[PDB]
Amino acid sequence: MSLQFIGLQRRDVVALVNFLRHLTQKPDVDLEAHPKILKKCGEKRLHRRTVLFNELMLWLGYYRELRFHNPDLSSVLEEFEVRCVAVARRGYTYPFGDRGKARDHLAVLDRTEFDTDVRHDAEIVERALVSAVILAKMSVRETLVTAIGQTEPIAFVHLKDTEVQRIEENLEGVRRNMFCVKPLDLNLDRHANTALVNAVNKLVYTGRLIMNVRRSWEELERKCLARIQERCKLLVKELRMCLSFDSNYCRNILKHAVENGDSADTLLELLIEDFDIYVDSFPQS
Amino acid sequence: DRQPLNPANIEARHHGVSDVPRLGAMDADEPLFVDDYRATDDEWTLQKVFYLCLMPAMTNNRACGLGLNLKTLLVDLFYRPAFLLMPAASIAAQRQAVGEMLTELVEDVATDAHTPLLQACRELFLAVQFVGEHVKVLEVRAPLDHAQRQGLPDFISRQHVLYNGCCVVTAPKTL
Amino acid sequence: KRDEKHRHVVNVVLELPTEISEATHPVLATMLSKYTRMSSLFNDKCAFKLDLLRMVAVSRTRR
Amino acid sequence: THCQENSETVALCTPRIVIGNLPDGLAPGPFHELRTWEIMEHMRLRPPP
């Protein structure tokens, strides 16, 4: 995919293109995580309109790289389905302090089917996690907060803390890098406890991983969307003073919205299509 | 068409941009060229009131819908050298120079002693910048709410909306 | 020939009078490079006509 | 009223400062407007200027 800047050298577009082509094998995937690459785009080195166009081109290439690299979910979703089925089987034949509310929470947990669009998997996996954690806290015979309004926190139940800090370091590392998925199953779970506790710990670890990769994807895509709308509004404002055919034409490109993903994609392909037309309105070098 | 319209990749547009395929793919049932989702809830409510109860009451149900064949009307109405050649720093001559149908269209409805017929027609041609599309009949398959979905769960209501058309009072005898 | 391509653009598919020249119309001088990259749509002569019409419209705005 | 402060439910009471804090099923619109007609008649402004 051709990504053209204007006031840029050969070495800098080489560095930017093998940064954008080698992002998934680099830790801490964020633009501001590697800000020398962003200052290679060249703020204060160049004029305003050209560096604003270069920033918007970089953010478009970043959004295309994000949406194309497409964080995979189907295998971890399938093992999450069989783990929900396993916790449902283990909760049938178990004696509880109360049968009715246990049966109610188990009824919320089972028959759990995910939609095809990735937006509503998070709330369904969250209600599955809160049902599983209610079964966990009640099955170990300790109290839960029964205050109406406040939900019970999604946490591991009766764990040794070295596995807990292992979970914190793994989940923070995937808060940095979210494209290489690595489901690290808890083989360090101790036996001789209740098997329902072991099944719900593995289930809640996979649920924490799923909700957190969706959270990281949402926050990064929302940050990039806000930044690209900011760059588009600044370029419309900055280009407004000059008047020509090419100037008003480049204005008529960026009047399209950017709040949708595919709107940003058609913005990028349009802005790369007739790039030689409006390039006279932008000063070079 | 009778095929369901699933993605956001069918509907797209470019606007004020030299776009040959969207002028080529007119009178086609596939693309459904829409600008951007501007209609929010209150404007949707006002729009529904104006085209559902405010219009047919006051006309006493005498309106109609029409779609102008916009490409041929625009090529016979603005492809003149007084429009293509334009400067940006004798009334019989300019009424001849504008056209033969346009000169009977903007002769009094927008022309006064301050600006002649040729002057305001440049600003009128300046809105061909944002060209529309042809008329399309869209049918709206929509089930009911979550209340009376239980009665007949298979029935889906069918509405019929006009796109790039116009609510019209009387037949345009010049058009 | 690129001259033959541009002559076929100005006087065959878009059908301009020879008073409307390439060397005097700068928006057409930019739009020849756009129009030469499509080998199709040469049967609907009004399509490129409306394209050049809205492009000379966007050439002469105030906004 | 009943409210919630720290993961618990506790009652809460406060005085209605004015007469207007009565609910609709206690002192509705026309009652207040006839009351203001009473105040107008007592203030010798029964035709409002």
Question: What one-character-per-residue DSSP string does A83-115 give?
Answer: HHHHHHHHHHT---S-HHHHHHHHHHHSS----
CB C15 within 8 A of CB C49: yes
- Cα separation, A246 vs A241, whole angstroms: 13
CB B71 within 8 A of CB C46: yes
Q: Which of A172, A261, A246, A256 is nearest to A213 (CA)?
A: A172
Chain B residue with minimum CA distance to C43? B24
**Chain C nearest C-alpha distance from A248 (Å):** 7
Helix axis angle, A121-139 to A195-239, nearest 10° = 150
Residue B138's DSSP bridge partners are B161
Do C and A make contact, counting contact as 3+ CB pairs within 8 angstroms? yes
Residue A226's DSSP bridge partners are none
CB A141 within 8 A of CB A133: no
Q: Which of A155, A177, A178 is nearest to A167 (CA)?
A: A155
- Cα separation, B63 vs B168, whole angstroms: 6
- Cα separation, B128 vs B121, whole angstroms: 11
Residue ranges of B 128-147 with Cβ closer than 8 A to chain A: 129
Angle, CA of A112, A122 and A34, to the nearest 5°: 145
**Chain B nearest C-alpha distance from C57 (Å):** 5
Per the CB < 8 Å rule, is C63 touching A277?
no
Chain D residue numbers touching A149 (CB-CB < 8 A):
4
> Counting beta carbons within 10 angstroms of the beta carbon of residue A113, is it exposed (0 to 12), middle (13 to 18) or buried (19 or more)?
exposed
**Chain C nearest C-alpha distance from B47 (Å):** 28
Neighbours of chain A (3+ CB pairs under 8 A): B, C, D
Sign of the alpha-carbon torsion through A130, A135, A140, A144: positive
For an interface test with B, give the residue of A67, A255, A260, A268 to mutate (most B CBs within 10 A). Answer: A255
CB pairs under 8 A between A and C: 17
Per the CB < 8 Å rule, is A274 touching C26?
no
Sign of the alpha-carbon torsion through A187, A193, A198, A204: negative
Q: What resolution does the deposited structure have, in angstroms? A: 4.2
Residues 6+ apart with CB under 8 A from A23: A29, A65, A69, A179
Name the region of A174 (left: φ>0; alpha: ψ -120 to 50; beta: rest).
Answer: alpha
CB A138 within 8 A of CB A96: yes
Neighbours of chain D (3+ CB pairs under 8 A): A
Q: CB contact, 8 Å: A253 with chain C?
A: no
Chain C residue numbers touching A248 (CB-CB < 8 A):
58-59, 61, 63
Tokens at residue A198, please?
A: 């072991």
Q: CB contact, 8 Å: C36 with chain A?
A: no
Chain B residue numbers touching C57 (CB-CB < 8 A):
125-129
CB A41 within 8 A of CB A51: yes
For an interface test with A, give the residue of D6, D7, D8 to mutate (most A CBs within 10 A). Answer: D7
- Cα separation, A143 vs A88, whole angstroms: 22
Q: CB contact, 8 Å: B14 with chain A?
A: yes
Tokens at residue A161, please?
A: 């803390």
- Cα separation, A89 vs A98, whole angstroms: 18
Chain B residue numbers touching A277 (CB-CB < 8 A):
18
How many residues can be counted in chain B?
175
From C30, C61, C63, residue closest to A277, measured CB to CB: C30
- Amino acid letter at A127? R
**Chain B nearest C-alpha distance from C24 (Å):** 10
- Cα separation, A38 vs B18, whole angstroms: 32
Looking at chain C, the residues that come just before a C–N gap of over 2.5 A are: none
Method: cryo-EM
Chain B residue numbers touching C49 (CB-CB < 8 A):
75, 79
Chain C residue numbers touching B78 (CB-CB < 8 A):
53
What SS3 class is residue A192? coil
Do D and B make contact, counting contact as 3+ CB pairs within 8 angstroms? no
Residue B157's DSSP bridge partners are B142
CB B63 within 8 A of CB B169: yes
Residue B160's DSSP bridge partners are B139
Which DSSP letter does residue A191 get? Answer: S
Neighbours of chain B (3+ CB pairs under 8 A): A, C
C-alpha R_g of chain B: 21
Per the CB < 8 Å rule, is D4 touching A148?
yes
Which DSSP letter does residue C12 get? Answer: I
DSSP string, chain B: --S----SSSS----SS--HHHHHSTT-SS----------HHHHHHHHHIIIIIHHHHTTS--EEE---HHHHHHHHH-SHHHHS-----HHHHHHHH-SSGGGTSSSSS--SSS-HHHHHHHHHTTTTS-----EEEEEEE---SSTTSSSTT--EEEEEEES-EEESS--S--
